[PDB]
Scaffold this active site. Structure first.
Site: not given
Lengths: 270, 337
Positions: B37, B111, B114, B153, B155, B157-158, B171, B188
């Protein structure tokens, strides 16, 4: 789809809050205020923050043909048109288009006041003109340093209250976060005898006459009134009126109790 | 037993916080494999431990970019906080070091990919599905906050999925220790709470806001505030008017008006009973909070794991070199790292 495009994190520059003026005419100032009042980042600013923000805005002159901003540059400034005509231009794939124009009014770049934002268009003066500009870091310091000043410590107004002297620091900051402001004109009735005991008040500036029947209390900067609303829900014993122009902080007691529980339980502590 | 758990936890934390950890490895000890990423502020890289064969996710930051972006402090926050915290749902830090050009943070490799990938591929999660994850966040935020740590943060994605199907948060670039109020505009765009947007000053209420956005987007498949232009998204956030999808259960909608509350005297998380308002809320009535903590619940979903260094569950990125200059950059600025 671009439902699979991630949403990038964003981040303005660090400023821990723990002075130049750009002269402009009266009418320039009104018009400049006018063009800013619906923009999100200006909409809710107290009058003095606003005034500080206009103060900071600088004069940019342009000659016919000059690029005010260029597409993909100028990621940190917001601009308001004082004067002149302008073309708007976007380059794509591809192709360079004129997508519109400005006729002596208009603004652009407000997103840059939040974080760096490469301009989406090139804008060119098509006459001689003038704009007002505003740098992001300048904007931020004004606002942040001003809220820091209102908040620790007007935490200082709160902590001087006998009913509230036993709050913890963090409980006190919760009240700092939400405490409202109210402004009254000479002889306005802030509180009426007989009314709901909804909220208490602190005088920030000016002066408040507490009366009953005549005079009981005189309130001025740092003093509270209506504070019995914190301990009993029974109706207003007195009446508050503004002497001249008055600014008060104001706290709904029911909001207070959502945050903190009953005020008396705080007074009980050891 | 919860009140004491946090006490022991605050103890352990304060010890590692004050007396921190440093230079616990070096670059030539790992083999780079794939980029996992990249983003606004740094990239992550699959690596293999040259001597034990172990796999790790290594965050790489570039000292020069960090200094230009005026984010030195955020980098020091992340490493300090990561070295001291400990929780089932936080990705653990294993090594950190720097060199002439980069800082490096070597995490556990999760593994399963996301949550963003999985949620976008499926569209939306059933309320029980979403509830399962939301619970881990409620518990993770309770932990962080009692240490006076905010995350900032949240979201999809994290949030990474492990082999047991549970969540790992990854993150920490925006995480900070805040006793009073802090002021940096960051996060974000879709997940920004009102008071961040308007620079009022803030502390832990913004994570709970963010959780409302997250929960909404898991169960609906899209976040509650969306538009063509960012400014219009912020105008919607500051408004706080939310439309719910018709399939939202009434219990769900109720939790979300309480989380997505612009008014701080009403936002769940910020009131007398703090996080208990959320944990005792009826949408969570079916949640066994100790069982979730203890990882004793079946995940609604388990990723496909084909082998130790497999990257099936991650998107593919343009692979940049890790370049290390013969000249040391920004030494003074990062002496503490």
């Amino acid at each position: 789809i671009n439902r699979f495009t991630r949403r990038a994190s964003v981040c303005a520059e660090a400023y821990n809050p723990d002075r130049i003026i750009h002269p402009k005419t009266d009418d320039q100032r009104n018009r400049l205020q006018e063009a800013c009042k619906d923009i999100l980042l200006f909409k809710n600013l107290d009058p003095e923050q606003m005034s500080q923000v206009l103060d900071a805005m600088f004069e940019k002159l342009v000659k016919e043909g000059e690029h005010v901003i260029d597409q993909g540059d100028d990621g940190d400034n917001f601009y308001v048109i004082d004067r002149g005509t302008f073309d708007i231009y976007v380059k794509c794939d591809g192709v360079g288009r004129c997508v519109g124009n400005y006729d002596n009014r208009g603004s652009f770049g407000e997103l840059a006041l939040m974080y760096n934002t490469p301009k989406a268009a090139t804008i060119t003066a098509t006459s001689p003109g003038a704009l007002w500009g505003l740098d992001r870091v300048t904007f931020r310091r004004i606002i942040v340093k001003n809220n820091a000043k209102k908040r620790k410590m007007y935490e200082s107004f709160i902590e001087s209250l006998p009913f509230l002297k036993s709050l913890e620091v963090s409980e006190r900051l919760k009240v700092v976060d939400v405490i409202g402001t109210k402004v009254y004109n000479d002889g306005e009735q802030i509180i009426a005898q007989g009314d709901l005991a909804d909220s208490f008040f602190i005088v920030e500036s000016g002066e408040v006459k507490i009366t009953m029947k005549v005079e009981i209390a005189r309130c001025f900067r740092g003093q509270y009134f209506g504070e019995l609303a914190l301990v009993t829900n029974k109706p207003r014993a007195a009446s508050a009126h503004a002497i001249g122009t008055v600014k008060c902080l104001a706290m709904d007691v029911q909001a207070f109790e959502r945050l903190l529980g009953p005020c008396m339980e705080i007074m009980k502590r050891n | 037993s919860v009140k004491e758990f946090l006490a022991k936890a605050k103890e352990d934390f304060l010890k590692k916080w004050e007396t921190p950890s440093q230079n616990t490895a070096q670059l030539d000890q790992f083999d780079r494999i794939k980029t996992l990423g990249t983003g606004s502020f740094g990239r992550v890289m699959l690596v293999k431990h040259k001597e034990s064969g172990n796999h790790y996710a290594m965050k790489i930051l570039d000292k020069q970019k960090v200094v230009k972006l005026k984010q030195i402090e955020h980098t020091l926050n992340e490493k300090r906080i990561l070295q001291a915290v400990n929780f089932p749902f936080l990705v653990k830090l294993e090594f950190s070091f720097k060199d002439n050009s980069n800082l490096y943070m070597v995490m556990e490799y999760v593994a399963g990919g996301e949550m963003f990938s999985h949620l976008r591929r499926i569209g939306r999660f059933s309320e029980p599905h979403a509830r399962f994850y939301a619970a881990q966040i409620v518990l993770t935020f309770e932990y962080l906050h009692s240490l006076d740590l905010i995350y900032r943060d949240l979201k999809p994605e994290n949030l990474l999925i492990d082999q047991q199907g549970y969540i790992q948060v990854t993150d920490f670039g925006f995480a900070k220790r805040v006793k009073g109020r802090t002021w940096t505009l960051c996060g974000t765009p879709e997940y920004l709470a009102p008071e961040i947007i308007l620079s009022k000053g803030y502390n832990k209420a913004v994570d709970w806001w963010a959780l409302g956005v997250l929960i909404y987007e898991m169960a609906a498949g899209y976040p509650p505030f969306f538009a063509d232009q960012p400014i219009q998204i912020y105008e919607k956030i500051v408004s706080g008017k939310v439309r719910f999808p018709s399939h939202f259960s009434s219990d769900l909608k109720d939790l979300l008006r309480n989380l997505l509350q612009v008014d701080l005297t009403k936002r769940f998380g910020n009131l007398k009973n703090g996080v208990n308002d959320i944990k005792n809320h009826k949408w969570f009535a079916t949640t066994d909070w100790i069982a979730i903590y203890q990882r004793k619940v079946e995940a609604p979903f388990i990723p496909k794991f084909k082998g130790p260094g497999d990257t099936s569950n991650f998107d593919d990125y343009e692979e940049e070199e890790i370049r290390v200059s013969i000249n040391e950059k920004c030494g003074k600025e990062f002496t503490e790292f």
